Design a protein around this ligand. Structure first.
Ligand SMILES: N[C@@H](CCC(=O)N[C@@H](CS)C(=O)NCC(=O)O)C(=O)O
Ligand SMILES: N[C@@H](CCC(=O)N[C@@H](CS)C(=O)NCC(=O)O)C(=O)O
Lengths: 202, 200
């Protein structure tokens, strides 16, 4: 008997989307529970840390996006082939989290002038360093993976962030990242999920 | 193995790693650098931060990735993948509280510092105490997760020590027993006595 997975998050990509990509890529079925703010009022105090995403695995509850990505990544064979690769994959995931956190105001700014200003102010300090970093990791990789020789949670995380930034970065100047984003995006499971998934502002 | 930990001369985000080494009784080089040396070193780290771990010439960044690696090699991530993930959830949760406490830790004037803390008390510190008091009440053995000491215990212990002047554990008997129990464990106790005395 398969574990029953239920992911709870708002109706949005946000901090849940890498988890949704892991399920998509692994072709592992789960319930994609998207709640409203109002439903969240009641649910928040019964969660372990007062946040979403949350994962329910056959009656047992786990919080924290990167802990959930750890668990699923491990079960789905997306944490490399040894404990060193696993740790390097998780380091990347945690590094992208810092960038995600810096981008929160931008993601939620619906005024286009103000949103462009938020982004401008992060361009040199965070976005350009991100692109350079991951361009270089890939340049130094022989297989076009962020860590090791197969797809991992880190690939999905960097992929997801590139999609987040798609309208604001030019990947012609980062040919490794351009190739990578097309490769991950064409993977079965991922490709159908991107077409399928609810279109949300963030 | 040859482990080198690089961080500032401080507890900060390296100290749980230092506690893991202490508890496991595993030798490592505790490399503490100055702010000035860090200017030079920063671009050759993977992400532009410390802590960093060098394991026989290979480098790993991210305090929680280092914790995950060392924790796993030392048996401090529970007994299965579910325990491990619950342990790391606690670690990641406490990291949010650490981030919120950053201005407070770095403000040295006593009245400005107290004002920083009080504005976080009901919003963040009190919820933290209630949360971890309850996790312990749910444990039969007085561990945050599972039946054995883990990285989660070391993380909650370190944060409680960080807050030791500001926090009364009068109403949190579970946490008070816990803080005592962890601090008395072989290796931890000696490390706390030996370690360099720093403001942060
Ligand atoms: N450490 C976290 C933070 C999760 C988080 O801050 N979630 C936000 C949404 S992106 C949330 O639950 N907001 C509603 C609330 O905090 O009440 C994780 O990575 O899961
Ligand atoms: N995601 C991080 C961040 C580490 C971090 O913010 N380290 C600070 C000291 S607490 C630092 O490297 N400051 C110097 C710098 O960022 O240039 C981790 O958990 O290792």
């Amino acid at each position: 008997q398969m574990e029953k997975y239920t992911l709870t998050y708002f109706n949005g990509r946000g901090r849940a989307e890498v988890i949704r990509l892991l399920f998509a890529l692994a072709n592992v079925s789960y319930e994609d529970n998207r709640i409203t703010r109002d439903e969240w009022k009641y649910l928040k105090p019964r969660t372990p840390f007062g946040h979403v995403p949350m994962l329910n695995v056959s009656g047992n509850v786990l919080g924290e996006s990167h802990a959930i990505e750890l668990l699923l990544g491990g079960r789905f064979g997306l944490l490399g082939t040894n404990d060193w690769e696993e740790a390097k994959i998780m380091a990347v995931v945690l590094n992208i989290d810092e960038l995600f956190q810096k981008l929160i105001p931008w993601t939620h700014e619906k005024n286009t002038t103000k949103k462009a200003e938020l982004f401008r102010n992060l361009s040199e300090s965070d976005v350009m360093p991100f692109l350079g970093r991951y361009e270089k990791f890939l340049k130094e990789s022989t297989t076009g993976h962020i860590v090791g020789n197969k797809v991992s949670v880190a690939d999905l995380t960097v992929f997801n962030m590139l999609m987040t930034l798609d309208d604001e970065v030019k990947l012609e100047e980062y040919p490794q990242l351009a190739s990578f984003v097309n490769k991950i995006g064409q993977m079965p499971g991922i490709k159908e999920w991107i077409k399928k998934r609810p279109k949300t502002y963030f």
